[PDB]
Amino acid sequence: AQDDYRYIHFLTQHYDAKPKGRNDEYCFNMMKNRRLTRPCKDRNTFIHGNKNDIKAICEDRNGQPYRGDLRISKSEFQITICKHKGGSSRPPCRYGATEDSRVIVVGCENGLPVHFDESFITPRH
């Protein structure tokens, strides 16, 4: 097929439409399901909600240029941040979850989001 991989890969590592727990157990299962445990990833953010509005950050409908090559969202998104506990690089990879709603920063390629900026911090609520 025509490379849609980076976009699908972004969705696999960062998207979960309708989550139910958004707690520590949620992160443990999700990091395992999405294959981010070998080695344990230190931090990973899952975005929830409408997929179309995430893709829309790559265009002017829901995004603005940020730091030249990135895009910052116009609207807030419900997100769950999973942060690794302990000093081991091996499973079981335990995580602490943080629920939040904020604007996010992503990198796009061909109008599709392909990178999530985990380093971005926001004007708090």
Swiss-Prot record:
TRNA binds at R22, C82, I104. A motif (Nucleolar localization signal) lies at residues 32-36. Serum and milk. Disulfide bonds join C27-C82, C40-C93, C58-C108. GO terms for cellular component: angiogenin-PRI complex; basement membrane; cytoplasmic stress granule; extracellular space; growth cone; neuronal cell body; nucleolus; nucleus. It comes from the Eukaryota. Its EC number is 3.1.27.-. Keywords: Angiogenesis, Cytoplasm, Developmental protein, Differentiation, Disulfide bond, DNA-binding, Endonuclease, Hydrolase, Nuclease, Nucleus, Protein synthesis inhibitor, Secreted, Signal, Stress response. It is found in: Secreted; Nucleus; Nucleus, Nucleolus; Cytoplasm, Stress granule. Its main location: secreted. GO terms for biological process: actin filament polymerization; angiogenesis; antibacterial humoral response; antimicrobial humoral immune response mediated by antimicrobial peptide; cell differentiation; defense response to Gram-positive bacterium; innate immune response; negative regulation of smooth muscle cell proliferation. One of its GO terms (molecular function) is endonuclease activity. The active site is at H14 (proton acceptor), H115 (proton donor). Homodimer. Interacts with RNH1; inhibiting ANG ribonuclease activity. Belongs to the pancreatic ribonuclease family. Secreted ribonuclease that can either promote or restrict cell proliferation of target cells, depending on the context. Endocytosed in target cells via its receptor PLXNB2 and translocates to the cytoplasm or nucleus. Under stress conditions, localizes to the cytoplasm and promotes the assembly of stress granules (SGs): specifically cleaves a subset of tRNAs within anticodon loops to produce tRNA-derived stress-induced fragments (tiRNAs), resulting in translation repression and inhibition of cell proliferation. tiRNas also prevent formation of apoptosome, thereby promoting cell survival. This is Angiogenin-1. It comes from Bos taurus. The gene is ANG1.
